[PDB]
């Protein structure tokens, strides 16, 4: 159907079915250096996102359901507005200021989970 | 609390709660080449460790409990000394000579586990 970013204007729940479409598009000596820098950067950016998913316990997934509650102060909206009316670009603007808080919480709940699972073994 | 390597002088069980602190810090043409080599190497070293965890069945984890027994000949100490008195730098010296043996055993038990799990499906 749609190709890369074709779902950008779609709602969040219509999109998020195309996650593999975007994931797969992330992959004279002076010209050689400029291009190696571009390629090295693409790899480094990719790996930082993968490392981050790993420490949150979401390695290998495109959709990862976590064990952190949603604070209503981050966005006081119902699922109907978020998944049926909004697009991902709009959502990203709405909660930009809470991104680092959420990320810190995700890392911490994984550290606790990982240890509890060791004690049970 | 502590930042990168701040737990280096702490005991092994006090440390190992800071694993994400260290994991996240691993990420004129002549100057361009020297820096690309440094960046390419950082990526290659990172990936070798990740590949190794993968073949041992520990992908995506910071703490991975395996199915290999500990030979008392590698280190004849009780959990109390290892986790409460020793630091990781001291431990690394103590068992340096057994690292390759342990790694070989981890790879082999994973190969057997992976096959048994196929036969059960």
């Amino acid at each position, epitope marked *: 159907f749609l190709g890369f970013l074709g779902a950008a204007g779609s709602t969040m729940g219509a999109a998020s079915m195309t996650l593999t479409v975007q994931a797969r598009n992330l992959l004279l000596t002076v010209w050689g250096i400029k291009q190696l820098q571009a390629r090295v950067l693409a790899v480094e950016r990719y790996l930082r996102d993968q490392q981050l998913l790993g420490i949150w316990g979401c390695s290998g997934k495109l959709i990862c359901c976590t064990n952190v509650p949603w604070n209503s102060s981050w966005s006081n909206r119902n699922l109907s507005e978020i998944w049926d009316n909004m697009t991902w670009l709009q959502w990203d603007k709405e909660i930009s200021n809470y991104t680092q808080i959420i990320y810190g919480l995700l890392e911490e709940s994984q550290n*606790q989970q990982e*240890k*509890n699972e*060791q*004690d*049970l073994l | 609390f502590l930042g990168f390597l701040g737990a280096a002088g702490s005991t092994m*069980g006090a440390a190992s709660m800071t694993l994400t602190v260290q994991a996240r810090n691993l990420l004129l043409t002549v100057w361009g080449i020297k820096q690309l080599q440094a960046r390419v190497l950082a990526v290659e070293r990172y990936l070798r460790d990740q590949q190794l965890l993968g073949i041992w069945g520990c992908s995506g984890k910071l703490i991975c409990c395996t199915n290999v027994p500990w030979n008392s000949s590698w280190s004849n100490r*009780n*959990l109390s000394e290892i*986790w409460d008195n020793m630091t990781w730098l001291q431990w690394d010296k103590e068992i340096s000579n057994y690292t390759q043996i342990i790694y070989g055993l981890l790879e082999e038990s994973q190969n057997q586990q992976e096959k048994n799990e196929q036969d059960l499906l």
Partner: antibody
Amino acid sequence: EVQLVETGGGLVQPGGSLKLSCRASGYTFSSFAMSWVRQAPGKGLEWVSLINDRGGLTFYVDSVKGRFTISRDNSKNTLSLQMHSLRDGDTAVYYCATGGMSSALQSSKYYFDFWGQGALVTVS
Amino acid sequence: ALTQPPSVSGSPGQSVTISCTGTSSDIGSYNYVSWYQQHPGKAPKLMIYDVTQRPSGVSDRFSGSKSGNTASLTISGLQADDEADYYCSAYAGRQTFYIFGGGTRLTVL
């Protein structure tokens, strides 16, 4: 020398609720797992619940599994046990004890090292 | 759970044995069988843990062992001060963590 002191009400109606607690001292509270054990008025000992040293993992005997909650606060050195519903069969002395589990990075216990004196709870 | 209902007795200086019988998916498979001493009206004290080990502060008059699915507590130089109820318990795996037997009353003659 360590101490474990149980406190809490001792008389309830069936169908109600009761919260017991246990104050600890003389040892690092946070280094040990803890549990509750009942002494029936005229019989033996029964294990009821167990909580991990960090408070994240709890276990229960089937007979109270849907009724009791075990909780821990390491900043106050206390345990608590919240009983709900309550049956006549729950009349017992409830002992606070240290032990029961382990933390997998230290030697195991699987036994109880210290006991308090016990709170007496009667269901009418 | 675990069983041993009878009273147990003997004269000062005589040894006595207190049994504790369980099953295979219990006492047979796990070596975690502690023993507790309780004088009526008092909280229990740990006497033996794991199988044979005693806590510091516990005298050498108390020892124990196991065979098959049966564990036992041995009291050697029996004293009048041993008049207490004795209980055995065991780790019975995950899900069912602990079980206890009824205890036995030790009478010194």
